[PDB]
Amino acid sequence: TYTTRQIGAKNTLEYKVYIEKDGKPVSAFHDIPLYADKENNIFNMVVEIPRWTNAKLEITKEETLNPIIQDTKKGKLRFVRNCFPHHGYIHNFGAFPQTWEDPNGDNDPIDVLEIGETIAYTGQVKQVKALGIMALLDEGETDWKVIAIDINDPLAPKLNDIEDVEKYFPGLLRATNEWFRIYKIPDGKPENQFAFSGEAKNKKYALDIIKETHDSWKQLIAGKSSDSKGIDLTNVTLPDTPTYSKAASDAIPPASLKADAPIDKSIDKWFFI
Amino acid sequence: TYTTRQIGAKNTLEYKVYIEKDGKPVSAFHDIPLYADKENNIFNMVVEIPRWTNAKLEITKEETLNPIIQDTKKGKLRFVRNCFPHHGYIHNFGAFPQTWEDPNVSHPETKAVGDNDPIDVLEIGETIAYTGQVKQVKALGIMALLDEGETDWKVIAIDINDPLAPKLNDIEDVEKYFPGLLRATNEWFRIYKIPDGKPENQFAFSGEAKNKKYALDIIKETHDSWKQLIAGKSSDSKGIDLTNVTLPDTPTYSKAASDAIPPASLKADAPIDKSIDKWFFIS
Numbered sequence: 001t002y003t004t005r006q007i008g009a010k011n012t013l014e015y016k017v018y019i020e021k022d023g024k025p026v027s028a029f030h031d032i033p034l035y036a037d038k039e040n041n042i043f044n045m046v047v048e049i050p051r052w053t054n055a056k057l058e059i060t061k062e063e064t065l066n067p068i069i070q071d072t073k074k075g076k077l078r079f080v081r082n083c084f085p086h087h088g089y090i091h092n093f094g095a096f097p098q099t100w101e102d103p104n105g106d107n108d109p110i111d112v113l114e115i116g117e118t119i120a121y122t123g124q125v126k127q128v129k130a131l132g133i134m135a136l137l138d139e140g141e142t143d144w145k146v147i148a149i150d151i152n153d154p155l156a157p158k159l160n161d162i163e164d165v166e167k168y169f170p171g172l173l174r175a176t177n178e179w180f181r182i183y184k185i186p187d188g189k190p191e192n193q194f195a196f197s198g199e200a201k202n203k204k205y206a207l208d209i210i211k212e213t214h215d216s217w218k219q220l221i222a223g224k225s226s227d228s229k230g231i232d233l234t235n236v237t238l239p240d241t242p243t244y245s246k247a248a249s250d251a252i253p254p255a256s257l258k259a260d261a262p263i264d265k266s267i268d269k270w271f272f273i
Numbered sequence: 274t275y276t277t278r279q280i281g282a283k284n285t286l287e288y289k290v291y292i293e294k295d296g297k298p299v300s301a302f303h304d305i306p307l308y309a310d311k312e313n314n315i316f317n318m319v320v321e322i323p324r325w326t327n328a329k330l331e332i333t334k335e336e337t338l339n340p341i342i343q344d345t346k347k348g349k350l351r352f353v354r355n356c357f358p359h360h361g362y363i364h365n366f367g368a369f370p371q372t373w374e375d376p377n378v379s380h381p382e383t384k385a386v387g388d389n390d391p392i393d394v395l396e397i398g399e400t401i402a403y404t405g406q407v408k409q410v411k412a413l414g415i416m417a418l419l420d421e422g423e424t425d426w427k428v429i430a431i432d433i434n435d436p437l438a439p440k441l442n443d444i445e446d447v448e449k450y451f452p453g454l455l456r457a458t459n460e461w462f463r464i465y466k467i468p469d470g471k472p473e474n475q476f477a478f479s480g481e482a483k484n485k486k487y488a489l490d491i492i493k494e495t496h497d498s499w500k501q502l503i504a505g506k507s508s509d510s511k512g513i514d515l516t517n518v519t520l521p522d523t524p525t526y527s528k529a530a531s532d533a534i535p536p537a538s539l540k541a542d543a544p545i546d547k548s549i550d551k552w553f554f555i556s
């Protein structure tokens with residue numbers, strides 16, 4: 001059973017969320033299997049950011065057991081601003097564990113946008129099916145975005161490929177295109193650009209990419225990548241890896257007893273680009 | 274000064290919010306002056322529903338001192354559903370006190386009776402408001418919504434404390450600084466009850482946002498309707514509770530009504546059923 005352990009107050013520099021398996025912290029990057037059901041391409045997704053929130057949360061590659069923390073720049077917590085007509089992040093945003101875009105690639109686990117009705121929670125492990133994939137082309141890095149749905153969603157049986165997103169979620173793909181293009185404009189950065197003219201490739205195409213990034217992670221965790229600088233490969237479930245250490249689980253502090261910190265009211269603001 | 278008195282937890286049937294002046298409840302409908310500054314057309318707005326929330330919180334016309342309570346259907350808490358690409362309400366939503374959309378006459382702009390409520394206000398400023406807040410706003414324009422076939426004007430307004438307030442003086446300024454907002458507003462009020470099995474709503478003037486001068490004219494009309502109501506002179510007051518603590522010349526004035534309200538019993542927000550998360554795709 002997967003649960004979460006929160007350190008610190010939410011919306012502070014001290015906030016960290018670890019994934020626990022049967023009460024013991026594990027690595028959110030390395031220890032959660034990519035496949036919940038390999039034969040049927042059912043994936044485990046680690047959720048970072050709930051739909052309609054603003055705090056930029058992500059698995060940190062550089063801390064032991066890779067907790068989810070809030071992104072910072074020059075000591076300040078980072079939030080995405082509200083870009084009309086959107087409210088914060090417009091999907092449940094996360095990543096597939098045991099994947100890595102080898103930059104020898106955007107240097108992170110492959111990104112996943114989960115489109116189901118229920119708002120997710122940070123550190124949630126949910127089971128999803130892949131529907132398709134877009135590519136943001138970012139400063140010479142291919143930043144893939146897998147489009148996925150929770151298998152427990154009421155609509156999941158009716159969605160199998162990317163054309164189904166158009167039928168059941170009309171305009172969601174367009175919103176995704178727009179959102180990714182504009183979401184950094186309030187931060188003083190340029191419009192982003194997509195490959196393939198913003199088109200989403202199909203499931204078959206997504207699976208090939210996901211599989212490549214899994215193979216890259218296999219090389220990484222085996223200690224065989226050309227360059228793993230800045231990545232903590234400590235794990236507690238893979239006994240024949242060089243960086244296996246069960247003791248890392250016990251070194252994690254206990255759950256903090258703290259209410260969410262307030263978010264500055266400036267984050268309410270709606271930007272019209 | 275205005276504050277709030279909360280009974281119970283948000284998102285429960287027990288939840289009530291009373292507006293207080295000097296720590297004592299007053300009628301949110303009748304006792305808050307329409308104007309904060311009459312000469313400059315600065316209005317008091319009673320906030321009901323913060324931007325990007327769902328709970329359908331309403332000044333309760335039929336309850337003494339008209340606390341804000343969540344509406345229900347078949348005894349269950351009512352929430353407006355998320356209609357793609359929107360998240361809940363896309364404005365800070367509330368009312369002007371001391372106004373009434375008269376349900377006993379057909380209004381000439383729409384050819385329909387009023388919806389029986391105070392005139393509704395969409396406050397477009399950056400900061401998310403809170404339930405029971407009294408804020409001061411300038412009117413910028415107005416839209417002639419027919420909501421389930423009833424005259425249901427929507428005033429477009431901005432909090433006078435918003436950084437942009439000095440730059441927003443008439444409805445054309447809203448399109449300048451908030452491009453696409455008015456179009457989205459038209460859409461939102463057309464579609465927002467489709468997930469509840471109700472028809473699309475409609476607007477007079479093909480959804481045109483009429484200007485400030487138009488808005489002030491209609492606000493005046495609804496204030497005049499309220500003056501008749503509170504005097505006890507409406508042909509049909511629809512069982513509205515006219516108890517008030519500040520209007521000595523009205524038949525229903527009662528300073529004592531304030532003392533009869535229970536003390537605050539504020540609890541943490543209760544959880545909302547996960548179904549309310551759902552995003553509906555209408556077209």
Ligand SMILES: [Mg+2]
Nearest residue numbers: 095108109111
């Ligand atoms: Mg990522």
Ligand SMILES: [Mg+2]
Nearest residue numbers: 106111143144
């Ligand atoms: Mg990426």
Ligand SMILES: [Mg+2]
Nearest residue numbers: 388390393425
């Ligand atoms: Mg109304």
